[PDB]
């Protein structure tokens, strides 16, 4: 069942936005996540 610590989140393109727009939104969320190290740790993409 692989790693059981952590959360496993999926960010989703719901409106045919496309790859670039989805990456930008990912960065937006990762950047906002990094501003809360008191709540969130190691928030990272599981991708290339």
């Amino acid at each position: 069942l692989g790693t059981a610590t952590g959360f496993d989140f999926e960010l989703i393109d719901q409106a045919g936005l496309g790859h670039e727009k989805l990456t930008q939104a990912r960065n937006q969320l990762l950047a906002e996540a990094a501003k809360h190290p008191d709540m969130l740790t190691s928030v990272r993409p599981n991708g290339l």
Binding site: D13, G16, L17, G18
Partner: protein
Amino acid sequence: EDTPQFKIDIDQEKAQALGVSINDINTTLGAAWGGSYVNDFIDRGRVK
């Protein structure tokens, strides 16, 4: 109930005499009057 339909007979001899292939005849007839699914494309991120 049964309905009128339009019976078209391809004349094989005349086609051969004119050098027109039956495949071209049938594709032309079917593609024009019936429509033909050629292949897929990508509309706002979704294959169609």
